[PDB]
Swiss-Prot record:
Record's subunit section: The dynein complex consists of at least two heavy chains and a number of intermediate and light chains. Interacts with DYN3.
Annotated organism of origin: Saccharomyces cerevisiae (strain ATCC 204508 / S288c)
Family membership noted in the UniProt record: Belongs to the dynein heavy chain family.
Compartmental location: Cytoplasm, Cytoskeleton
Function: Cytoplasmic dynein acts as a motor for the intracellular retrograde motility of vesicles and organelles along microtubules. Dynein has ATPase activity; the force-producing power stroke is thought to occur on release of ADP. Required to maintain uniform nuclear distribution in hyphae. May play an important role in the proper orientation of the mitotic spindle into the budding daughter cell yeast. Probably required for normal progression of the cell cycle.
Other known facts: Present with 195 molecules/cell in log phase SD medium.
Boundaries of the shown chain within the full protein: 4005 to 4092 of 4092
Domain notes: Dynein heavy chains probably consist of an N-terminal stem (which binds cargo and interacts with other dynein components), and the head or motor domain. The motor contains six tandemly-linked AAA domains in the head, which form a ring. A stalk-like structure (formed by two of the coiled coil domains) protrudes between AAA 4 and AAA 5 and terminates in a microtubule-binding site. A seventh domain may also contribute to this ring; it is not clear whether the N-terminus or the C-terminus forms this extra domain.
Domain of life, source organism: Eukaryota
Protein name: Dynein heavy chain, cytoplasmic
Length: 88
């Protein structure tokens, strides 16, 4: 379902997209000069700055989850050293 909803997001669309909350992607100019489209889409990546919350904002899943993942990896590390220290 997830793959489908990202496929639905990135591909189905017209004349503006907003793949990620800040960055909009227009569909090809009437001029259709490919040398120009390459520089344009290259340019629009150069005007981009990936945010801090990017894993939550750019990947459509919520922030509350990411925080759980961060909380979660911390739990693995801390469980491990608790067990190691208790063993010695």
């Amino acid at each position: 379902e997830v793959v489908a909803k990202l496929c639905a997001h990135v591909f189905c669309g017209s004349d503006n997209l907003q793949i990620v909350p800040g960055v909009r992607i227009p569909q090809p100019l009437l001029q259709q000069s490919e040398e120009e489209e390459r520089a344009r889409l290259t340019a629009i990546l150069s005007n981009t700055i990936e945010p801090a919350d990017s894993l939550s904002s750019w990947l459509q899943l919520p922030r509350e989850s990411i925080l759980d993942y961060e909380r979660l990896q911390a739990k693995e590390v801390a469980s491990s050293t608790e067990q190691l220290l208790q063993e010695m």
